[PDB]
UniProtKB/Swiss-Prot annotation:
<comment type="subunit">
    <text>May form homohexamers. Interacts with N protein.</text>
</comment>
<protein>
    <recommendedName>
        <fullName>Papain-like protease nsp3</fullName>
    </recommendedName>
</protein>
<feature type="domain" description="Macro 1">
    <location>
        <begin position="1"/>
        <end position="165"/>
    </location>
</feature>
<comment type="function">
    <text>Responsible for the cleavages located at the N-terminus of the replicase polyprotein. Participates together with nsp4 in the assembly of virally-induced cytoplasmic double-membrane vesicles necessary for viral replication. Antagonizes innate immune induction of type I interferon by blocking the phosphorylation, dimerization and subsequent nuclear translocation of host IRF3. Also prevents host NF-kappa-B signaling. In addition, PL-PRO possesses a deubiquitinating/deISGylating activity and processes both 'Lys-48'- and 'Lys-63'-linked polyubiquitin chains from cellular substrates.</text>
</comment>
Length: 165
């Protein structure tokens, strides 16, 4: 199962890890992708997860969008986890760099409650432009299921742990 995580709360754990390497090692039931509404996995966590699937995640995602149209900011869809997990839960956190409502971050984390255990990144962090300290606080105050957070950046991981209330 998951190893080397620091316990933050009853149900939230955190580790300085590359979520792709973590997914290949654990092969969890659910890996969360930091998706956009179009499921265009170009960069950040999405670009890295997609590259690890040899673009199979993008091919599956384009078929999903062709059939269903875009997701909502704050929404999600369950697709295959390919070689990384049983399932990938593509969750759209607000992208502050695109002027999206930061208040939708709680709605985005509510998607995690439909899964008993997940390997996940901090939503809206990184290239999505939100403050990761705020993302972690919304995560702990919203998610009730078991969430194993992988934070790629060591310096950010240390700041998140040392400032956690
Ligand atoms: C790229 C280094 C790790 N990192 N990942 N997301 C962030 N972002 C921030 O620290 C930030 C954005 C708005 C306020 O603070 N840093």
């Amino acid at each position: 199962s998951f190893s080397g995580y620091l316990k933050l709360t009853d149900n939230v754990y955190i580790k300085n890890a590359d979520i792709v390497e973590e997914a290949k090692k654990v092969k969890p039931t659910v890996v969360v992708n930091a998706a956009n509404v179009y499921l265009k996995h170009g960069g950040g966590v999405a670009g890295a997860l997609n590259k690890a699937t040899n673009n199979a995640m993008q091919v599956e995602s384009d078929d999903y969008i062709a059939t269903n149209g875009p997701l909502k900011v704050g929404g999600s869809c369950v697709l295959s986890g390919h070689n990384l997990a049983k399932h990938c839960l593509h969750v759209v956190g607000p992208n502050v760099n695109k002027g999206e409502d930061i208040q939708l971050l709680k709605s985005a984390y509510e998607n995690f409650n439909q899964h008993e255990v997940l390997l996940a990144p901090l939503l809206s962090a990184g290239i999505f432009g939100a403050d990761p300290i705020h993302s972690l606080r919304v995560c702990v105050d919203t998610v009730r299921t078991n969430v194993y957070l992988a934070v790629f950046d060591k310096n950010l991981y240390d700041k998140l742990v040392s400032s956690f209330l």
